[PDB]
Amino acid sequence: RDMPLDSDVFRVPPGYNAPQQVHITQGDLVGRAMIISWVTMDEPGSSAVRYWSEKNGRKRIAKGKMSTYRFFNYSSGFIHHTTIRKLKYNTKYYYEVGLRNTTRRFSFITPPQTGLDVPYTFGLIGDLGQSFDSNTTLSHYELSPKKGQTVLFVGDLSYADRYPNHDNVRWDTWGRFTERSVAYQPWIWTAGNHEIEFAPEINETEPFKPFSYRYHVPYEASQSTSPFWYSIKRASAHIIVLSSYSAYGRGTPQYTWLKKELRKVKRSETPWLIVLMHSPLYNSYNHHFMEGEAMRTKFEAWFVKYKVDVVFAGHVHAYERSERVSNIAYKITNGLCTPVKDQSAPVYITIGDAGNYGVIDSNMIQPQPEYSAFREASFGHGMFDIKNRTHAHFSWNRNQDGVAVEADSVWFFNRHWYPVDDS
Amino acid sequence: KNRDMPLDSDVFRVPPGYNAPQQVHITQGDLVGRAMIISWVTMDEPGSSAVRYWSEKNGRKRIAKGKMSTYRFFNYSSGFIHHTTIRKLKYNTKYYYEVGLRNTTRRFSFITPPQTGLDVPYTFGLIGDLGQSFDSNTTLSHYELSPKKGQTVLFVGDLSYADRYPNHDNVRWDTWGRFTERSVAYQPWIWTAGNHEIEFAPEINETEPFKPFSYRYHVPYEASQSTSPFWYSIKRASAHIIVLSSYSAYGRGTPQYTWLKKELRKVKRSETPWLIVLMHSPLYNSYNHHFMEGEAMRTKFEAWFVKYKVDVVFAGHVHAYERSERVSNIAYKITNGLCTPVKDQSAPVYITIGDAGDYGVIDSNMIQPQPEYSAFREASFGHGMFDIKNRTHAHFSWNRNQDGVAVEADSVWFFNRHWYPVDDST
Numbered sequence: 040r041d042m043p044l045d046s047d048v049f050r051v052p053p054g055y056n057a058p059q060q061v062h063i064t065q066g067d068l069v070g071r072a073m074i075i076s077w078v079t080m081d082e083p084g085s086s087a088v089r090y091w092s093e094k095n096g097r098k099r100i101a102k103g104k105m106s107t108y109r110f111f112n113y114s115s116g117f118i119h120h121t122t123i124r125k126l127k128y129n130t131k132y133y134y135e136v137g138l139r140n141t142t143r144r145f146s147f148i149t150p151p152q153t154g155l156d157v158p159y160t161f162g163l164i165g166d167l168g169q170s171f172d173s174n175t176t177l178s179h180y181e182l183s184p185k186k187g188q189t190v191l192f193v194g195d196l197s198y199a200d201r202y203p204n205h206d207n208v209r210w211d212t213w214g215r216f217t218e219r220s221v222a223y224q225p226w227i228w229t230a231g232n233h234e235i236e237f238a239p240e241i242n243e244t245e246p247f248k249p250f251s252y253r254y255h256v257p258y259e260a261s262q263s264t265s266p267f268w269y270s271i272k273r274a275s276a277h278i279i280v281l282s283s284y285s286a287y288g289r290g291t292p293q294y295t296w297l298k299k300e301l302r303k304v305k306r307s308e309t310p311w312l313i314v315l316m317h318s319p320l321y322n323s324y325n326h327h328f329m330e331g332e333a334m335r336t337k338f339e340a341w342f343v344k345y346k347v348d349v350v351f352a353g354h355v356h357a358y359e360r361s362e363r364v365s366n367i368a369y370k371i372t373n374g375l376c377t378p379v380k381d382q383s384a385p386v387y388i389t390i391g392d393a394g395n396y397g398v399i400d401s402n403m404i405q406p407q408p409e410y411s412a413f414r415e416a417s418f419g420h421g422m423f424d425i426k427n428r429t430h431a432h433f434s435w436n437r438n439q440d441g442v443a444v445e446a447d448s449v450w451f452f453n454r455h456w457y458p459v460d461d462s
Numbered sequence: 463k464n465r466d467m468p469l470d471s472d473v474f475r476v477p478p479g480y481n482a483p484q485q486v487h488i489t490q491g492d493l494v495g496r497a498m499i500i501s502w503v504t505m506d507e508p509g510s511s512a513v514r515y516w517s518e519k520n521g522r523k524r525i526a527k528g529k530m531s532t533y534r535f536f537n538y539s540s541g542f543i544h545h546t547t548i549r550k551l552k553y554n555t556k557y558y559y560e561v562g563l564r565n566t567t568r569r570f571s572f573i574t575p576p577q578t579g580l581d582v583p584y585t586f587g588l589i590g591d592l593g594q595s596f597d598s599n600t601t602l603s604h605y606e607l608s609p610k611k612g613q614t615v616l617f618v619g620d621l622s623y624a625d626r627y628p629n630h631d632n633v634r635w636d637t638w639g640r641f642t643e644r645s646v647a648y649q650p651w652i653w654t655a656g657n658h659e660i661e662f663a664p665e666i667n668e669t670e671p672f673k674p675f676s677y678r679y680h681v682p683y684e685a686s687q688s689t690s691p692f693w694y695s696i697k698r699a700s701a702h703i704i705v706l707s708s709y710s711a712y713g714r715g716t717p718q719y720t721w722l723k724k725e726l727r728k729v730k731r732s733e734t735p736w737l738i739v740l741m742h743s744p745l746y747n748s749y750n751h752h753f754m755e756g757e758a759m760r761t762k763f764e765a766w767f768v769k770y771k772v773d774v775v776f777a778g779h780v781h782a783y784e785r786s787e788r789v790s791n792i793a794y795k796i797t798n799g800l801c802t803p804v805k806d807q808s809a810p811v812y813i814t815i816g817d818a819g820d821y822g823v824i825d826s827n828m829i830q831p832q833p834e835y836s837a838f839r840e841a842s843f844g845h846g847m848f849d850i851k852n853r854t855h856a857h858f859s860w861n862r863n864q865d866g867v868a869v870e871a872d873s874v875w876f877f878n879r880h881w882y883p884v885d886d887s888t
């Protein structure tokens with residue numbers, strides 16, 4: 040069910056050395072920067088980005104870096120990453136790439152300065168892939184009247200690793216296909232298991248290699264030492280991105296980083312505390328049942344201690360919304376291993392249903408457990424729409440519904456600023 | 463509070479002569495025991511990485527050529543580290559070897575193991591969390607003086623504790639190398655990485671995990687088709703030893719997870735009936751210190767250990783001694799309430815042996831009451847011995863530093879899970 044190579048969504052932008060696979064993401068901690076990324080296929084080209092605000096109309100130049108990689112017998116084109124800095128808040132910018140030969144122009148709008156009541160609408164997309172289902176989900180997202188301003192992407196991007204030798208051409212197609220969204224609004228990247236691409240049989244033993252060359256993240260801005268875990272702040276939200284497939288034992292870099300990062304969160308500046316990871320800690324579907332248990336034993340108690348509002352994950356190709364529950368009272372021999380209602384705990388949402396390679400996960404463990412509020416095996420996407428420091432509205436849209444139809448929706452009451460039972 | 467041996471202690475003396483090799487240490491260099499990695503440091507100049515070696519019988523002297531490396535850690539600059547692999551050795555024979563051939567030569571010896579086989583006896587020492595306190599020295603002394611005669615040390619992690627010093631003062635890696643040489647220059651120590659080897663110190667711009675340890679202690683990880691030094695397998699006599707990394711990734715689909723799943727399928731109990739796992743952090747631990755830190759890895763690998771009938775899992779990290787019953791806790795399914803360990807005669811025994819001395823502190827606070835899964839636990843310094851007699855029987859003993867070197871405060875017969883799975887409860 041993967042879209043054929045000649046699909047319209049995979050068309051090559053015309054013109055000699057025209058930039059393609061253009062994508063942007065936040066480039067700093069607070070929203071004044073953007074990483075601009077693209078690929079040129081005919082020759083290295085310039086890594087310069089020309090950009091200007093609509094407000095001041097002053098054309099500026101930022102210089103970046105070009106890189107290449109190989110994977111088995113695949114050789115990449117020329118990958119460009121350029122960080123535009125010192126941007127004004129809440130301002131429309133135009134930017135151009137391909138300054139030496141064929142120039143292409145895009146735009147984005149910077150977020151407002153971080154603050155207590157700053158509204159912002161986040162899209163939720165996971166396990167996207169490049170099937171016709173993937174295209175429908177992307178269409179529904181961009182047609183949504185809630186108007187997403189940034190996608191929180193919970194992992195499993197291209198599924199290129201399903202192809203012979205992970206045929207990395209399917210990374211190039213995915214980049215051309217997603218450009219119509221991510222060239223104009225940031226996607227916040229989480230690494231999933233299809234990004235691991237550990238393939239010792241063809242001597243590719245470096246985890247996350249193609250993904251890490253193609254998708255950069257501002258990980259140094261939160262004093263992380265690795266691209267696979269990091270934080271950003273945007274509007275009223277503090278977003279923590281974790282790596283299900285990296286080390287998280289006590290004392291490891293990721294564990295150390297997260298422990299310190301949670302102490303740095305200021306709910307008086309960013310009231311909405313959001314965690315992204317690929318593998319869900321709470322999941323009542325058959326597929327990947329209990330894979331999240333290892334990270335849960337390490338980090339669940341911290342999520343409760345710090346009153347995380349919501350944890351988004353993918354991996355399971357379906358939709359699930361938990362109750363606020365915790366399973367943190369276990370001590371090996373005390374028998375306390377059943378999740379209980381816990382209003383201090385986040386809501387766990389699985390949103391890995393954007394299409395993958397066309398397969399939905401319909402097998403559910405029955406009956407629906409007490410910890411699960413709502414689950415359905417349909418393709419779709421989410422929207423987390425912050426109104427102010429106390430209220431955020433989450434909605435789930437199905438591909439088989441109208442683009443303005445929400446099959447599930449719930450009001451989030453903030454755990455720090457308004458801890459009322461939002462059951 | 464500071465019980466570390468002072469820099470001028472006799473165990474830290476520098477071998478005399480210009481560029482004399484120091485911190486000499488060996489470990490198995492291949493999968494089956496026909497090779498040895500020879501390692502050492504020269505301090506005055508790079509020197510030669512050549513190793514001269516010969517058996518005590520035929521006496522034909524050969525040269526193996528190795529590689530030199532250096533590293534920096536903050537304001538520390540290492541000396542010149544040599545690693546050289548001697549290959550194609552004969553089984554069960556004594557070899558002499560010489561390092562420092564350019565200037566000051568020093569000579570040592572080792573005895574290769576017998577060829578792997580079903581009924582091959584072999585005596586393994588167990589040492590965890592050694593450190594360089596006076597307690598550490600006593601433990602090493604007790605091991606060297608054992609009447610049972612250890613032939614290889616299985617070391618379950620936390621080596622030098624240099625990371626406790628300001629800027630992890632890597633001089634304390636050098637001292638530890640000189641201190642331990644009296645043992646490890648003559649018999650292999652099998653290295654497991656512990657949390658004191660991570661040395662993740664972003665505050666001083668040292669962010670490469672395991673850097674000083676991995677420069678100083680090499681392992682034959684390619685021999686078992688691992689892509690990382692931090693997890694690997696070796697076979698020695700009748701034992702198949704799997705070394706895991708508590709502080710590397712082990713999620714589904716990760717390199718270590720993938721490697722272990724495939725490696726367990728390669729185990730042949732008719733060739734190496736004793737299946738032994740090493741890791742730093744214990745999956746079963748009834749002490750307060752580090753209680754339940756092993757849960758995450760336990761969720762991933764415990765069921766595999768039972769499926770493959772691992773005989774024993776050795777760990778350190780807790781600075782005390784513990785021996786579990788044969789139990790498993792693998793039946794949990796979130797909502798089925800099955801989260802209590804049960805007797806399980808396919809399961810390994812879990813032994814915590816992280817009590818060789820560290821920086822001088824014992825972990826004495828225990829979970830009360832002693833849980834059913836715990837057979838024996840005691841907060842004393844000491845070390846262990848896993849003495850394989852044959853394919854059905856291995857004798858494990860625990861010697862305390864406060865006792866005579868021949869006294870075993872705890873001991874138990876292991877009955878092999880493949881050839882003789884009798885209840886061997888204490």
Ligand SMILES: *[C@@H]1O[C@H](CO)[C@@H](O[C@@H]2O[C@H](CO)[C@@H](O)[C@H](O)[C@H]2NC(C)=O)[C@H](O[C@@H]2O[C@@H](C)[C@@H](O)[C@@H](O)[C@@H]2O)[C@H]1NC(C)=O
Nearest residue numbers: 156158424425426427428429430431432449450451452457
């Ligand atoms: C924070 O955002 C909430 C969601 O928009 C606000 O609630 C909404 O307030 C409207 C009046 O401004 C009201 O018609 C809507 O029904 C309501 N939506 C709900 C409750 O889901 C909230 O407004 C405060 O709380 C509500 C319950 C009323 O008491 C309002 O008068 C309050 O202003 C916003 N909080 C603010 C603005 O402080």
Ligand SMILES: *[C@@H]1O[C@H](CO)[C@@H](O[C@@H]2O[C@H](CO)[C@@H](O)[C@H](O)[C@H]2NC(C)=O)[C@H](O[C@@H]2O[C@@H](C)[C@@H](O)[C@@H](O)[C@@H]2O)[C@H]1NC(C)=O
Nearest residue numbers: 581583849850851852853854855856857874875876881882
């Ligand atoms: C493997 O080694 C075991 C320990 O040395 C052997 O058991 C010991 O056998 C002695 C002489 O047969 C006997 O005096 C000891 O009591 C006994 N030790 C223990 C702890 O049981 C074992 O020998 C077999 O097993 C024992 C239990 C008897 O049935 C013997 O008759 C058997 O030969 C060795 N097993 C082998 C070589 O297969």
Ligand SMILES: *[C@@H]1O[C@H](CO)[C@@H](O)[C@H](O)[C@H]1NC(C)=O
Nearest residue numbers: 042046047048171174175178
């Ligand atoms: C993908 O969806 C877009 C927007 O609905 C449509 O124009 C395009 O033809 C689709 N391409 C496919 C399904 O290959």
Ligand SMILES: *[C@@H]1O[C@H](CO)[C@@H](O)[C@H](O)[C@H]1NC(C)=O
Nearest residue numbers: 111112113114203204206208
């Ligand atoms: C890579 O190798 C496969 C065979 O394993 C072949 O079919 C494919 O065309 C090769 N691709 C390139 C770009 O050489």
Ligand SMILES: *[C@@H]1O[C@H](CO)[C@@H](O)[C@H](O)[C@H]1NC(C)=O
Nearest residue numbers: 535536537538539628629631
């Ligand atoms: C490294 O810095 C420490 C702390 O300032 C100092 O005591 C030590 O002598 C230094 N080591 C060097 C410069 O080799």
Ligand SMILES: *[C@@H]1O[C@H](CO)[C@@H](O)[C@H](O)[C@H]1NC(C)=O
Nearest residue numbers: 467471472473596599600603
């Ligand atoms: C360490 O132990 C050895 C052997 O028991 C002894 O000769 C030496 O003096 C000790 N060194 C210390 C305690 O510093």
Ligand code: VN3
Nearest residue numbers: 516521523558569
């Ligand atoms: O083999 V002779 O140099 O002691």
Ligand SMILES: [Fe+3]
Nearest residue numbers: 166195354395
């Ligand atoms: Fe997926």
Ligand SMILES: [Fe+3]
Nearest residue numbers: 591620779820
């Ligand atoms: Fe220790």
Ligand code: NA
Nearest residue numbers: 327328330714
């Ligand atoms: Na699974």
Ligand code: NA
Nearest residue numbers: 318330713714
């Ligand atoms: Na996992």
Ligand SMILES: [Zn+2]
Nearest residue numbers: 195231232354
């Ligand atoms: Zn996945």
Ligand SMILES: [Zn+2]
Nearest residue numbers: 620656657779
């Ligand atoms: Zn430890």
